[PDB]
Structures are given as C-alpha cells and as structure tokens.
Write a protein that binds this ligand. Structure first.
Ligand SMILES: COc1ccccc1C1CCN(c2nc(C3(F)CC3)nc3ccc(N(C)CCO)cc23)CC1
Ligand SMILES: Nc1nc2c(ncn2[C@@H]2O[C@H](COP(=O)(O)OP(=O)(O)O)[C@@H](O)[C@H]2O)c(=O)[nH]1
Ligand code: ALF
Ligand SMILES: [Mg+2]
Lengths: 317, 6, 298, 658
C-alpha cells in the first residue's frame, strides 16, 4: 500500500530537519507542548555550543579579551547538561559577555578546526529572546535545534492522494551499519549531502574531509545491486551555509580539482553537483539533484512538489 | 547302627 | 563280625551298575571328543575334562566296594584316602569349571571388548590350570579324614575295617558344611545369577527382533541357558543333602529302616551326580550346529 | 541357524548401529595426548620438513579445526575473517540456483555491505567490483566469492597465523600430530566381528576401531599362504594400488585407511560397505532393468575414470567386486589384480572368465585401461541378463568361454533398447582401436554416449539420484559364515617364515594422514580435546599450588627439551623418565623439578647411534673414555628429532674444538 523511502546521508547532513519539514507541511504542525519541550533542547544546544567553543579556545590557546568573563568561562566548564534544567540568570549574562567577546568570536570564525553546530549563530543572534523566561520558540527555532538521531525511525506519512512512508536513519559511521535492515523494499532513495561539509572534517574522524566520506557513501549506495529498480534523488542541502563558506573559504584548498573562479556560489554548487553525479558507475542510471535548504520551508515545499511527482511517475503500481 | 559310607 | 553289612537288593545293584556303565560309555567318549574338538572353547574343554576324569575315577573304584554289596574296603588304606581325595577334587573341578564357563559366556556376551584383555587370550589356559589347582587344593581334607578304621567289635574279622570319616562327627560335620557351600552354594548362586542376566540380555534381543531361525535360535539359547541351572540343581542338590543327612544326624535317630533307605539314596544320588557328566556334550550339540559338525565328523 | 552364528550376527549389527547419534561414545579405548611440553620437540620436527606453513596446517582437517577454533574464540581480529570464509565455503555447497541466490544476497549483506557502509572493509577493489557486477547481473556461480576466499587466505597468513603459532592451540595441534605420527596398529586395536568374505590369500572381517569406534572392513592376508603361492609381489602391489587410489576423494572406490602386519598376517583397513556386493543382490533381486542399471553404470564409469586417471587398470571387474553402501550407492572394492600401465603396458592374462577382454586373453599382446571397458560391457550384460555375454560357468567350459575371441556378442534386441544396444556394441568390440573408451577422450568418450544423454554427470558425482536398490538394514547382507568357510590350515604345513621373508614387509605398515584425521574429527576430537583441557587445568593448578612449574623459561639458550628415559643397568627400574634440556654446549638433565644437573658436554660425544632394546628403539650416546648412555624416547618423531639435534650439536661442538 504505502511506499517505503529512505533518507540517507552522513551525520549532521540534515535528514531529521527534512523529516521535520515534511511533517510540518504534509503532516501535523508542532503543538505548544512540543515547543515547551523544545525549549530545553534549545537550552542544552546553546550550552553545548558554549562549552565546545570554550574547549576549542583552550586547546588552541587563544587569549581572551575580558578578564572577568574568564571566571564565567570557568563556570561554563562546570556546567553539565546531564542534570540540566532551564536557563538561569547567572548564566545568561556570562553567555552574552562571552559571545560579545571578540576573541571567542574570532575563534568561532575559525570554527573549521573543531566540531560545532551550524545553529550557533542563529541562537547567538536570538540571545535574550531565547534565553528569556517567556520562551515561545517559533517553527524556525524548533527546526534549527540539533538532536543526534540514532537507530531506524520509520515515519509514516501520506501525500494528498498517495501514502509514502519515510525512514530516518543516523549518519554517524558507527550507526550506518544498522541500515542493512531498512533496504528490504526501497522504492526510492533520497540522499542528503551538506554543501558546506567541504570545509569541515568528520566528527568520528579528525583527518578525513566530510565531503570525501559523503562521496564514498554515495558511491557505495549507488553500487548496491538491489537498488537498480529504485530511483535516487540527491538533495544538495545547506546551500545557505555554502554561499557564505565559499565567500570565506577557498574550495581549491579542500578539492584542488575545482579550478573554477572563486567566490562564485553557483559555480561551486555546479562543481559539487557534477562531482557527485560522476560517481555513478553506469550512465544509463539517472540521478536527480535539487539544491535546497531544510531550514527554509518554501524550498522544501518546492522541492517536494516535484519529488513526489517524480516518485509517482517512477512507480506506476 | 550308623552309615560308614559317606 | 558281620554287623557292618548293607542289605540293598542284588538286582538293584545290577540295575545301578548297568545304568552306570551306560552313562560311562556315553560320557567317557563324548567328553573326550569334545576336548579334542575344543576363549569359551578353553572353558568348555576344561569342563569336559573335569567330567571325563570324574567318570574315569569315581565310577569304577566305587563300583565294587561302595556301589556293590560287599562292605569291606578293597583298595587298601592308601586307597581309602586317594579315592575320596580324587572324588572331591573332580567334584570341585566340575563345579568351578561350570562357574568359570558361565563367567566366560557372560564376558563374551556383555563385555565383548575388554574380555579380550581380561581373558588375555592364551592366558585362559593358565586360568583353567589355576582353577584345576584350586580344585585339587580344596580337597586336602579328603586325604586325612577318610582313612581305614577298625570298626568291627571283633577287630580281626574278614571285613572288620572300612573307609570312614576318622575324625569325630563334629569335625566331619563342619568340614562337610564348608565343603557344600564352597562347592555347591557359591558356584550355584554365581551360575544362577550370571545365567539369569545373560538370559535377560538374550530376551531383550528377542523382543527387539520381534527371521527364520534367529527367533528360534535365541529361544533355544534361553531354554538351554535355564536348563543348565535346572540340571545343576537336580544333579547336585541330592548329593549334598545326602551328605548332610549323613553328617548332621547323630546316633539318636539312626534305625535299620532309615539306614537301608539312606543306602538306596546313595545309589540314587550318585546316579544323579554322574548324569551331569553326560549331560554336557548333549547340550553342546543341541545348542550349536558348527560344533555339532566337527563333533559328528570326529 | 545355530546360536553362535546368530549371536555373532546380532553383535555385529548392534556394534554397527550402537550410539549412531553420539559417535564419540562408541569408543572403548581412549586417546592419550602427550603432555603440552611435547611442542618443544614437535615444532622443530615439523619445521625441519616445512610442515608448519599456513597452507600446510590450514589444509589439514585437525589443523583447520584448531585454527578456526582459535580465531573465533581467542582473536577478535580474525573472527570476522574466519566467519566470512566459513560462510563462503557453506555457500559453495549449495547446488540449486534458487537457494544460492538468497544465500549470496545474505552473505553480501552480512559480510560486505555492512563493513563497506562502516568503511571497515579491508578487502581489495577488484574483489568488490567483481562480486557486485556478478550480483547486479543476477549471477550466482559457486565460485562467486573465490577472490574473497583468496584475499581472506592472504589476510590470515599474516600476523594471525603467527599469533596462532605462539598460542596454546598450536600446542594442541602438536599434541594431535604427535599422536598421528606415532600410530603402531596391532590386532588388539580393533574389535573384529564375524567374517563377511573370503578369497585370494586371505579373508575379510568387519571390525570396529577401539580408540575411535569407527566401523571398518579388515582384509587379512596370511603370510604363509602368500609364500606358498609365491604371491609376495601381488601382496605388495595391492598395498601400492590401495595407497595410490586412496590418495584422493573419489566416492566410488573402497579407500584404505591403515595398513599393518602381524607376525603371520598382512592387513588392510578399508571402508566398510555393509550393503554387500552386487552379485548377492543380483541373486536375490534378479536381473535389473535398464533404468535401474543406468545408476550402476554411471557410478562404475566414474570409478573407472578415476582409476585410469591414476594410470591403474582394474583387470577384475565383476558384479561381485561392486559393493553397495548403506544407502545403496556402489563402489569398486577388490584391487588385488589391479596393475599400473603407465610404465609398461601389462601382457598377462588376468581376470575372470567371461569378463576378460579379448586382448587380455590373446597371448603376449600388451593392453591398457582398454580391458576395463570390455569388462564393464560384460558386467552390464550380466546385470541385465544374469550371465556374461558369453556362456556362463554352468553353460560351458573355461576354454569355451575364452572362445569369445572368435565370435561376437548377441546384442539381443528383445531385452535391450537401441541406445543400450549401441553402447554394448561399442563396449564389446573385438578390436581395441575402435572400442568405446579405448580411443580419444577415454572415459569422456563413454560418458557422452547416447545411453547417458539424460544424465547430468555432476549430479552423478554428487550422488543425487535415487538408488534402485536399498540394502536391508536389519541383515548382514553377506553369506553365512559357515558358507564362507575358512582356508585349510593343513595346506600351509611345512612352510616356514624365514627372516628373509619377514624382511619383505619391513616397510609394509602405513597410515594415511587425511583418513585418520577425518576419522578423529568425526568421532572423538571434541571429547578428547575437552578432556585434555581439564587434565591440563588440573596439572597447572597443582603446579601453581605446589610450585615447580613446567619449565624455568627453558633457560636462556636451550635448543630443545622433553621427556626421555635413561637406562643402562638391569639392577634398577629401567623406565627412568626424566626431563632433558639440550644446549649447544651440553645436555642438561632434571628430575621431578628440584634442580637440573649437567649430564654431558658435547665435547664428550664420541658418536650418536641407535639401538633396539626390549622391543623398543633407543638412542645410544657413546662417551669419550668408553662410557655410554641409553636414551629411550616416547614416540617416533621424538626419536628422529632427538637423534638429529644431538648429532647436530655433537658435530658442531667437535668442529669448533677441531
Ligand atoms: C552358561 O553356559 C554353560 C554353563 C554351564 C554348563 C554348560 C554351559 C553351555 C551353555 C551352551 N553353550 C553356549 N552357549 C552360548 C550362549 F551362552 C547363549 C549365548 N553361546 C555358545 C556359543 C558357542 C558354543 N560352542 C559349542 C562353541 C563351539 O566352538 C556354545 C555356546 C556352551 C556352554
Ligand atoms: N542553516 C541550515 N541548517 C541546517 C540545514 N539543514 C540542517 N541544518 C541544521 O543541521 C543540524 C543537524 O542536522 P540533523 O537534523 O542532525 O540532520 P541528520 O544528521 O541527517 O539527522 C540541525 O540542527 C539543523 O538545524 C540547512 O539547510 N540550513
Ligand atoms: F548526524 Al545525525 F541524526 F544528526 F545522524
Ligand atoms: Mg537525525
């Protein structure tokens, strides 16, 4: 009855964000209790970002500008999110002072040297409103919250006239092994790759570029013999991150083969798309690609409007 | 009397 | 002078001697041909030899001064001891040969592998020699207990002396009581138990099979395996119970009627005792056809 | 029937059926592995002949068992590799494509896709691409994973095998190998059951091996009968042929496991075919039908193909020489008259009347495997008609039967189909050069005949067809022991076995390593391994509690060490077993564990020799000044290696002193 889909990609790529977007558009919008719960999630995300960037500053031995905030920094090291609660007054001022500190700002601008959530800037801009006790996060805040997903999670859903069940899976290397059991009757595969992953290395490995791992995984998935009868769609996510990363980072250093002009977001996107589509072994196969940004509802709407039609045309029964 | 042959 | 006579009928003596001669002409030849015909083979040969010597030794000498009407001993003082020693030794040999043959059959049928080492093949010859030696060793009292005695009141008549238990009736009683248990009860119980368990092991096979002669062969096997114990009972118990009625009963009960009845019981018991010597090659033939082939050929 | 024959039959049948679901319990003797200190000698013994390579051990049944057991329980790195190899080998034995498809998909998912997704796959890219191209094209050949097998073998040859060697399971392998190399069979090692056949120089009995419980057929040849008929050459050629054909895995020939001889008998231990010969079954069942005879013809053709591939000519092919197994499959049994035609084609007239080829009867004309095809034609004619194409024994005299050279087979169409008639025409040609199997491809020429057009020969090799006759399970399937009879011992009276006669059979005894290892693996490998583990644990605990460990790190420069018995005096107990240590400069000797003491420096060694004492072989060390020591080792490998290494130390020490 209902067709089975997979959302595949390396960790942090953005699969769960697309699941949230699909639920929001063609499902049930999140309720007040949902946002109340997500408040705490946003709080621990902010705490994790603060701790990670302080640890990065320490490892990189970058001096601080504010001596007083150093005390707060120590307090930051003492905060533990296992026995977590709502944000408290003594922490909001310290976080604001740290974020306003130019030294840690430069450290974050150098974020390529360590792992960090892409939502850090958004929450930092939010500041008081998010940290305000009267926290009423909007759909954007809920979408821009990071919660590492693990294990196979089937998400039943249906279109306006057809039923298409999705499957969200983890992207961490240790967890990918668990996909064996979700390939039983795949009707079409959606693959997510972070356009901005070209600069950051994996989390599980600090020496392998994320883009190389993503390309290897895409090749491995296409090489699967039993997917020959299933369509594949390559969602190029996080274009809004890449349009700034390229402006701030040169794609030549990561992949020198991209000899195109610098600062051209469209050129870099086209180069990445060509590089990924080239990995297919046999040209008779067709690969559909769509630039997108899971954090924007309109882009997901537009992409899905055609993805559903393509899937329906692919499977006539 | 008494037997003599065992 | 003539107070020590026995009045058993002469015709009874003639009939007894005729039966003895028939049993002799049977056994003396059958057991010898069996011994020539031949681990169980060694035990069968030993038993056949024991039967053959029993017939060759006990029957003739007893046929005149014991199994006849003349009371005076005619084999001399040395004969008084030799005759009884040989008789006891041959009786022990037969009983222990039967026990060992039952043991060997048990080992072969229930312990097929370890029997090769425990029996140790050619060492079974030494084992049968050992059983013969033990039989000869257990009959020493028959040498120094059955000696010539001057029993007649006159003391100088033509038959005043005769071979009799020298020692007092108490010692004769105790020696005979140990003899019966060491020669009848122990071999009897060993044979009965081992043959019963072997018959059980054959009956389980018969039930499992339940062939043209396999069923018949096993049925006859169990039949003979029981008939062996029945024949042991019949042939041996009368002898030992007669010896018991001799030794245990003191002078108080003895009377001429019971005296003569015991004397006839002597003929009956000895006939039963000698029947066992002949019974063996008969059953051997009735059991195995392969043995019968050589037995009739030779 | 008599009681004693019936009991023999019952005992034989019960021993054949006893504890069939638990073969380990069928044994009555117990294998005693040497102490774990044996490896110090056995590793050098095997290394000196290059038998401790990965290919050598991994190709042995016990070696593979122990290596797999080590990998899957004591080295996590090699666990996935051995699991993958074992799964591939299980896959290779799937015959049907439908099942093999799902098997291949499961294997690929479990041992390739998961690892590749995790990026943990170490295997090459040629193998990955080959396999994926084969699956995507929906192909599942039995050799699909062969590149993966090769790469697994390459991976295991590395540090995994060295870690195995330094482990204690290589010590267990050395113990089992010492047990294997120290086999000295005598008639007391087998439980000999009733007779099942007689002929030639001897007889045949069913028997059970004591220490493993496996049922065998024992063929005992009397040395006196061999001498009386001047058959020593035939007796030795029989062993040669049995060892030649047993070296393999053909399921259509009765293979030999052990050969040994007593002072009076030569003995071969062969596969037990309790189903009985095919002549017995032909007498009972009567003449077979063509569809029934296809099975026997195909199996016999494969067996003859095997023998001819080994350049053996089976000059005696009768329905009587074909033995049925428990399930009804046939094997060729009696290799007494077999000959080797590679060196020089035979010319003697050997065989059975009515089955000998015309070129075998012709005087002085050489012949090759050719004769087996004429004998096969005659055998099939008998199976379908009850007698040879020419007059049987009761129909004509031997010479009249031999007149086959001057006539032709009737080729009765009333009883044979046209294809069968063509096959028998081809097999029963007088002239050799135009006979089936006598030209061109040999056996392949017969296998492609129209008579076998509807028969897949690979399925014949795997024995997937239903036999046309299943021998009864509750019967011996042989003539009564009385019918078989026995040879007349009086015939050999006046025959003396001189030393020159026994010298012929000096090297007769033989054991085939693969057969013994397969028997041990089937029957008692696990039981003896677990027991020995318990004994070693007890010994180690006792040593730890009371001290006096097995060795003090074997010194600093010890070459070898192990138990030997010192001798030399009749006035004391002679089996003085004590632990010896060998160093380049001396041979240390230690008691129960208190302390060692120097026994000889190698400068003293005048010479190292061997001697025979008390039915045992002992070394003889001659010492400067006329003194001597006698050392008796516990096994043949020990003796060989101790002699070799003592000789090496002595020679090197004297050369240095020179
Ligand atoms: C318990 O056996 C005794 C004990 C006391 C006296 C006689 C016997 C005989 C019973 C029958 N017989 C045999 N019995 C059995 C049984 F116990 C029933 C299994 N299997 C045999 C097998 C062979 C054989 N031969 C005549 C050997 C010829 O070479 C005799 C027997 C000989 C001993
Ligand atoms: N700015 C931006 N952030 C994104 C986009 N897609 C995903 N993210 C963020 O990336 C974070 C991790 O994505 P996640 O949900 O874990 O994807 P998953 O690893 O496949 O489950 C989330 O907190 C998202 O807010 C995008 O297109 N633009
Ligand atoms: F990397 Al994820 F859920 F965020 F697998
Ligand atoms: Mg997720």
């Amino acid at each position: 009855r209902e067709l089975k889909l997979l959302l595949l990609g390396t960790g942090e790529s953005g699969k769960s964000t697309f699941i949230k977007q699909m639920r929001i558009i063609h499902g049930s919008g999140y309720s007040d209790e949902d946002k109340r719960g997500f408040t705490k999630l946003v709080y621990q995300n902010i705490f994790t970002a603060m701790q990670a960037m302080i640890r990065a500053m320490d490892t990189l031995k970058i001096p601080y500008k504010y001596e007083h905030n150093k005390a707060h920094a120590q307090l930051v090291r003492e905060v533990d999110v296992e026995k977590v609660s709502a944000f408290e007054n003594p922490y909001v001022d310290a976080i604001k002072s740290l974020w306003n500190d130019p030294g840690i700002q430069e450290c974050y601008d150098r974020r390529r040297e360590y792992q960090l959530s892409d939502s850090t800037k958004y929450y930092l801009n939010d500041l008081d409103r998010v940290a305000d006790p009267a926290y009423l996060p909007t759909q954007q805040d809920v979408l821009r919250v990071r919660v590492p997903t693990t294990g196979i999670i089937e998400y039943p859903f249906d279109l306006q006239s057809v039923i298409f069940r999705m499957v969200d899976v983890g992207g961490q290397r240790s967890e990918r092994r668990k996909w064996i059991h979700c390939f039983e009757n795949v009707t079409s595969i959606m693959f997510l790759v972070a356009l901005s992953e070209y600069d950051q290395v994996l989390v599980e490995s600090d020496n392998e570029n994320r883009m190389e791992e993503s390309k290897a995984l895409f090749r491995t998935i296409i090489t699967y013999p039993w997917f020959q009868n299933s369509s594949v769609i390559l969602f190029l996510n996080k274009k809004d991150l890449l349009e700034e990363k390229i402006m701030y980072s040169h794609l030549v250093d990561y992949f020198p083969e991209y000899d195109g002009p610098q600062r051209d977001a469209q050129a870099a996107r086209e180069f990445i798309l060509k590089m990924f589509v080239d990995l297919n072994p046999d040209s008779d196969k067709i690969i559909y690609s769509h630039f997108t940004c899971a954090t924007d509802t309109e882009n997901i709407r537009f992409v899905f409007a055609a993805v559903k039609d393509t899937i329906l045309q692919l499977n006539l029964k | 009397r008494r037997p003599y042959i065992l | 002078s003539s107070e020590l006579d026995v009045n058993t009928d002469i015709y009874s003596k003639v009939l007894v001697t005729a039966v003895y001669l028939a049993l002799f002409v049977v056994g003396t030849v059958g057991n010898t041909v069996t011994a020539f015909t031949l681990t169980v083979h060694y035990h069968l040969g030993s038993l056949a030899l024991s039967d053959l010597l029993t017939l060759l030794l006990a029957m003739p000498v007893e046929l005149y001064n014991f199994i006849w009407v003349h009371h005076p001993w005619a084999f001399g003082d040395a004969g008084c001891r030799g005759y009884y020693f040989l008789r006891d030794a041959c009786t022990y040999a037969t009983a222990l040969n039967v026990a060992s043959l039952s043991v060997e059959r048990y080992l072969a049928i229930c312990h097929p592998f370890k029997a090769k080492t425990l029996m140790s093949r050619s060492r079974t010859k030494k084992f049968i020699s050992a059983i013969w030696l033990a039989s000869a060793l257990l009959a020493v009292p028959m040498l120094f207990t059955m000696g010539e005695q001057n029993r007649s009141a006159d003391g100088q008549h033509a038959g005043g002396l005769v071979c009799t238990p020298t020692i007092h009736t108490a010692t004769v009683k105790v020696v005979i009581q140990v003899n019966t248990f060491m020669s009848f009860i122990f071999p009897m119980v060993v044979i009965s138990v081992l043959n019963t368990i072997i018959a059980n092991k054959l009956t389980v096979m018969v039930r499992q099979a339940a062939e043209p002669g396999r069923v018949q062969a096993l049925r006859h096997g169990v039949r003979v395996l029981r008939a062996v114990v029945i024949a042991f009972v019949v042939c041996w118990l009368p002898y030992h119970v007669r010896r018991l009625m001799f030794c245990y009963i003191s002078d108080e009960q003895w009377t001429p009627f019971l005296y003569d009845f015991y004397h006839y019981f002597y003929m009956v018991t000895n006939a039963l005792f000698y029947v066992s010597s002949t019974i063996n090659p008969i059953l051997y033939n009735l059991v195995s056809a392969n043995f019968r082939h050589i037995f009739l050929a030779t | 029937a008599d009681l004693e024959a019936v009991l023999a039959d019952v005992s034989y049948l019960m021993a054949m059926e006893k504890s069939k679901a638990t073969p380990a319990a069928r044994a009555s003797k117990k294998i005693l592995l040497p102490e774990p200190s044996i490896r110090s000698v056995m590793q050098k013994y095997l290394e000196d002949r290059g038998e401790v390579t990965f290919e050598k051990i991994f190709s042995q049944k016990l070696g593979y068992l122990l290596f797999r057991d080590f990998c899957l329980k004591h080295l996590e790195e090699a666990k996935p590799l051995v699991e993958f190899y074992e799964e591939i080998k299980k896959y290779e034995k799937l015959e049907t494509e439908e099942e093999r498809l799902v098997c291949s998909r499961e294997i690929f998912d479990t041992y390739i896709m998961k690892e590749l997704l995790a990026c943990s796959h170490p295997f090459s890219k040629s193998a990955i691409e080959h396999v994926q191209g084969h699956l995507v094209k929906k192909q599942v050949p039995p050799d699909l994973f062969q590149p993966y097998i090769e790469e697994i073998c390459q991976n295991l040859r590395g540090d995994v095998f060295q870690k195995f060697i330094e482990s204690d399971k290589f010590t267990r392998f050395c113990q089992w190998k010492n047990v294997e190399l120290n086999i000295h069979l005598t008639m007391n090692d087998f439980s000999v059951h009733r007779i099942i056949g007689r002929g030639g120089f001897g007889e045949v009995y069913g028997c059970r091996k004591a220490d493993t419980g496996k049922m065998y057929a024992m063929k005992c040849l009397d040395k006196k009968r061999i001498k009386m008929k001047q058959g020593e050459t035939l007796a030795l050629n029989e062993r040669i042929m049995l060892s030649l054909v047993s070296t393999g895995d053909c399921p259509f020939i009765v293979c030999m496991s052990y050969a040994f001889h007593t002072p009076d008998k030569l003995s071969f231990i062969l596969d037990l075919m309790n189903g009985g010969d095919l002549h017995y079954h032909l007498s009972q069942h009567g003449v077979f039908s063509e569809p029934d005879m296809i099975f026997y013809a195909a199996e016999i053709i494969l067996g003859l193909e095997h023998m001819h591939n080994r350049f053996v000519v089976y000059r005696d092919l009768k329905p009587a020489n074909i033995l049925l197994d428990e399930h009804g499959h046939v094997r060729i049994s009696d290799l007494g008259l077999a000959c080797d035609f590679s060196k020089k084609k035979p010319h003697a007239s050997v065989g059975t009347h009515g089955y000998m080829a015309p070129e075998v009867l012709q005087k002085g004309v050489a012949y090759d495997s050719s004769a087996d095809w004429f004998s096969l034609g005659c055998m099939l004619f008998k199976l379908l008609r009850g007698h040879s194409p020419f007059r049987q024994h009761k129909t004509k005299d031997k010479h009249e039967i031999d007149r086959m050279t001057l006539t032709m087979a009737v080729e009765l169409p009333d009883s044979f189909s046209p294809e069968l008639r063509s096959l028998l025409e081809g097999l029963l040609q007088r002239d050799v050069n135009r006979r089936l199997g006598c030209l061109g491809r040999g056996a392949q020429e017969v296998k492609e005949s129209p008579f076998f057009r509807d028969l897949d020969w690979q399925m014949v090799f795997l024995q997937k067809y239903p036999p046309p006759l299943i021998p009864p399970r509750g019967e011996v399937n042989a003539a009564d022991a009385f019918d078989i009879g026995s040879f007349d011992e009086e015939d050999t009276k006046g025959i003396k076995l001189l030393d020159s006669d026994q010298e012929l059979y000096r090297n007769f005894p033989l054991t085939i390593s693969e057969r013994w290892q397969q028997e041990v693996a089937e029957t008692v490998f696990d039981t003896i391994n677990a027991e020995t583990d318990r004994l070693e644990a007890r010994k180690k605990t006792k040593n730890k509690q009371l001290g006096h460990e097995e060795d003090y790190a074997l010194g600093k420069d010890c070459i070898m060490h192990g138990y030997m018995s010192k001798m030399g005096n009749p006035f004391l107990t002679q089996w003085q077993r004590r632990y010896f240590y060998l160093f380049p400069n001396r041979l240390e000797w230690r008691g129960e564990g208190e302390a060692p003491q120097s026994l000889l420096t190698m400068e003293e060694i005048q010479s190292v020799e061997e001697t025979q004492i008390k039915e045992r072989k002992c070394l003889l060390l001659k010492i400067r000044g006329g003194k001597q020591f006698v050392l008796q080792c516990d096994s043949d490998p020990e003796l060989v290696q101790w002699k070799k290494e003592l000789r090496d130390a002595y020679r090197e020490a004297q050369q240095l002193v020179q």
